[PDB]
Structure 1
Amino acid sequence: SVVGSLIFCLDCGDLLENPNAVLGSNVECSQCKAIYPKSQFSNLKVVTTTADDAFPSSLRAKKSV
C-alpha cells in the first residue's frame, strides 16, 4: 500500500508518477502500464518532528532533574 508519502505498484513495485502532478484519473507507471489507484487514495501526508538535539538551552538542562 501507501507508506507515508511513498506508494508503489502492487505487482511490480516501481516508482510512479506523482498523483498530485497527473491530469488523468489514474497513475501510469514508469516501466509497466497499469492503473493504481483510481485516484481516490488517502491523501499524501506525513507527520515529522524534531530530534531533541538541535535546540540547545540552559532551560533544557533545567528539565534534567
Structure 2
Amino acid sequence: SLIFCSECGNLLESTTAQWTTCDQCQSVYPSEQFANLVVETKSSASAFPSALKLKHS
C-alpha cells in the first residue's frame, strides 16, 4: 500500500496533490497507472473490552 520511486529511493509525494516525481531523482511517471489505490485498514483481535467474548470464546 505504498508508492516509492524506482530510480532513487525517495518516497514520492501523494498523487492526490499533483503529478508524481521524486524530489531528488526527479523521475516522472503516469499518474493514472497507480491511481485509485485500495486501502483496507483493520483492527487486531482481542483489543476491545468485551461483554460477550465470555460466551463467544
Which TM-score band applies after superposition, normalised by the shorter structure? 0.7 to 0.9
Structure 1's 42 and 18: CA in aligned 2 closer, same or farther, altered over 3 A? Answer: closer
Report the equivalent of 1:39.
31
* Superposition misfits of 4+ residues, deviation over 4 angstroms: none
In the alignment, structure 2 segments of 5+ residues that lack a partner are none
TM-score normalized with structure 2 length: 0.75
In the alignment, structure 1 segments of 5+ residues that lack a partner are none
Q: Number of residues paired by the alignment?
A: 56
Identity among equivalent positions (%) equals 48
Report the equivalent of 1:17.
13
Partners of 1:42 and 1:20 lie apart in 2 by 9
